[PDB]
Design a binder for this molecule. Sequence first.
Ligand SMILES: O=C1CC[C@@H](N2C(=O)c3ccccc3C2=O)C(=O)N1
Ligand SMILES: [Zn+2]
Length: 96
Amino acid sequence: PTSLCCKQCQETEITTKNEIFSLSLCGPHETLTVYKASNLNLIGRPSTVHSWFPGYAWTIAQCKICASHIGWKFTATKKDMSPQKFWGLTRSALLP
Ligand SMILES: O=C1CC[C@@H](N2C(=O)c3ccccc3C2=O)C(=O)N1
Ligand SMILES: [Zn+2]
């Protein structure tokens, strides 16, 4: 009911509406950023190439059940950043 599940298989809860926060600046969208996620397997090592959140690297994250590409784990390159990690999830890969 606050639950966001992999659209492809509908088995797994990936995150909840409670975990949602915003990195985007409110002064002078398609990607959902959450503090915490579940049931995702990480593929490969982190990379900073073309990172959508400067200062973070990304690791591909797919549903552990059906292997659908739901988003990425973003990890901080520097110790002084917060949060040190979060998830960027493709909204259309989630239900609702
Ligand atoms: O933060 C990110 C993570 C995902 C990442 N990405 C793509 O989705 C992608 C698709 C095809 C080639 C290269 C990339 C690429 O680096 C991207 O451009 N930025
Ligand atoms: Zn799935």
